[PDB]
């Protein structure tokens, strides 16, 4: 009938979450729901049956949906795109301890660094590539099961939302220009009206191509021969080949044309111009910054939050994305909106964070780690071998 | 939490820059910082711990930015590229000085001549191809390991950002003219009303292509054989090939159209030609002078400014863009505002240069070498084998 939370705790509600009311009882339990019908806890193996006893389930008369809060945006002083990302990253109360945290309640071992006994605490920050890496410092020494291999948290693949009436551009500039193609002309008009119906036009396109084929045959043949000084012989022979091919192909093109109106009784000059260059010019807009999250290390024996529990201590690798949906496994909003159905709890639980943390530090800790971050933004564009033209009309000559 | 430059010079902002704080003290040295933290110098290896010493770091509470300043720009008189050119080099005072001072903090060695005994004197200035070079006399003799060896500092690829409402050019004129095609034709009116639903167009297109393909084989055959006069044999075989083939293609098309207006129980003729000719014609304009410097010569061994800091006197070669953004590599402002970050110092340690020479000379010998140009430029286009074209609508005849 209606969807149920299982953190918030009918013989069909009662089956639509069944895995999860049995393994929160005692083995041999029985407990009671509407209309007659009971739970067998486990080694009954969650039968669900009509009977009684002595204990039952029961739902709050005014449960809640147990949602993410959303925050207020935070302010990052403007710049450019790496200096907005070293403000972000070295911020440790709005960005390091609760990703941490977050890694923590997953189950990876080990977040912190040798100064500290606490979470998030003596993390070092470095610049790796185009992204940055957050990993506890391993100075020193420490005590404990493998305690040098650090969780590592990872930040990379930044994307901005603009805000529509804020984009500006500047001067644009060009280097080491060569020519393509030029054409000249003239379009006359000897008549006592306007002409407008004239056209020329320059076209230029460039493209690449690639092929690949597999063929394989078989051949008889079957000879005989007499020797009567005179050898008379005879050849008679067949074959079969099969073959098949697979390719592909890429092309570019770009045109420009003219089309004057022309007085009565006049003609007008008419050029166009086709170069390539290199193409640079300075941008500044507003912005929203989205990225994508990695947690890397291995996984704790006593208990961890990924769906098949594994307790070998495996190493382990998952990326979510901190922005805007783009698929189900990267995405917490919705893996924490779907928990009451059992089907799709394929990457991490969260019904097991909620039972081992409580729904209060859950929530809050989520709501910070995705806190929407606003900026402003200047940069330069640059590009090598692109397109540059040219289109005239010139002024009209009296015939 | 905030960027740090280390010549200005929190236990994060101390990690951020934890090489240059670590390089500037003594072995066995411990200096404190905020909140209990302490650094370790050498030998312990730059460790960051709870502590206590009778030495400590601080920032200024008033630091500055240390920005390149820009400078008014400088008038060159005008004439065409290279009497620009010519002039640009040539001006010791505001070129081939700031210029040789730029090579010589960064580490190149004997930069000037013969004849005096100061960076940047008895410079020599000679034309090379499209390009300039500038290196000190050699006459005579010096004294010094390798001081025949002298640095060499060489200008090209000179570019032009124009203002837009200054360009204008010339006469077109053709000569070597060669007809492709011609056609003529009418467009008759007998109706009681105007039509302009008529067209002629012509079209005229060439295009290259080219082809490389690599192929691989096998076949393996038996034969048996009875000579029981008359010899019989049977011959079985299979075989197996592999092939792949890449290529690419370029097409140039160039078209011309007609389209009149004719009036009611008339007509009117019409006429369309192409010819392929050389082009040329003068212009003017007033614009930027930009261009790419490239520094040649081996480094010292007593210091120089390259980030692995080499020992071995290596000859080197680095190339600068002065003006508009292209690279990273290339460009002095990138490299000198991102000083503040070490995972991006790849090519010169631009904080060594501010230690070895302080940073109101650094800064006022950028900022003559960045300095904006401005010139007048006259000229003369030139091209082989274009296009040129004539299209006319002629007066009308009453039917």
């Known amino acids: 009938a209606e969807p149920v939370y299982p953190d918030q705790l009918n013989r069909?509600?009662?089956?639509?979450?069944?895995?999860?009311?049995?393994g929160m009882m005692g083995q041999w339990q029985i407990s009671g729901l509407a209309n007659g019908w009971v739970i067998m806890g486990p080694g009954y193996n969650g039968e669900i049956k009509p009977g009684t006893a002595s204990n039952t389930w029961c739902y709050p008369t005014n449960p809640v949906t147990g949602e993410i809060p959303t925050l207020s945006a935070l302010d990052?002083?403007?710049?450019?795109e790496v200096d907005v990302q070293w403000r972000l990253v070295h911020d440790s109360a709005n960005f390091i301890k609760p990703t941490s945290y977050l890694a923590h309640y997953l189950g990876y071992a080990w977040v912190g660094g040798n100064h500290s006994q606490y979470v998030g605490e003596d993390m070092d920050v470095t610049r790796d590539g185009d992204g940055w890496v957050i990993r506890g410092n391993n100075d020193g020494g420490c005590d404990g099961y493998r305690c040098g291999d650090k969780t590592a948290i990872k930040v990379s693949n930044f994307a901005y939302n603009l805000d529509p009436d804020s984009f500006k551009h500047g001067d644009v500039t060009q280097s080491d220009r060569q020519l393509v193609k030029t054409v000249v002309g003239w379009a006359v008009n000897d008549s006592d009206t306007p002409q407008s119906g004239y056209d020329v036009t320059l076209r230029y396109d460039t493209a690449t191509n690639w092929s690949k084929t597999n063929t394989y045959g078989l051949s008889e043949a079957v000879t005989t021969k007499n020797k009567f000084e005179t050898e008379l012989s005879i050849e008679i022979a067949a074959n079969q080949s099969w073959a098949s091919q697979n390719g592909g192909s890429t092309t570019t093109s770009l045109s420009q044309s003219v089309r004057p109106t022309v007085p009565a009784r006049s003609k007008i000059p008419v050029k166009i111009?086709?170069?390539?260059?290199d193409i640079?010019?300075?941008?500044?807009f507003?912005?929203?910054?989205?990225?994508?999250?990695?947690?890397?290390?291995?996984?704790?024996?006593?208990?961890?939050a990924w769906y098949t529990h594994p307790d070998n201590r495996p190493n382990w690798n998952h990326t979510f994305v901190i922005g805007p949906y783009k698929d189900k496994a990267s995405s917490?909003?919705?893996?924490?909106?779907?928990?009451?159905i059992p089907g799709e709890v394929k990457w991490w639980d969260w019904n097991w964070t909620i039972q081992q943390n409580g729904l209060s530090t859950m929530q809050n800790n989520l709501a910070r780690v995705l806190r929407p971050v606003r900026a402003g933004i200047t940069g330069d564009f640059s590009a090598e071998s692109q397109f540059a033209g040219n289109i005239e009309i010139g002024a009209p000559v009296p015939l």
């Open 286 to 304: 507003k912005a929203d910054v989205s990225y994508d999250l990695t947690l890397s290390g291995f996984l704790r024996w006593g208990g961890n």
């Open 332 to 340: 917490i909003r919705y893996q924490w909106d779907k928990r009451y």
């Open 273 to 277: 111009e086709l170069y390539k260059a």
């Open 280 to 284: 640079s010019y300075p941008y500044e």
């Open 76 to 80: 990052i002083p403007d710049g450019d």
């Open 12 to 22: 069909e509600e009662a089956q639509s979450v069944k895995s999860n009311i049995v």
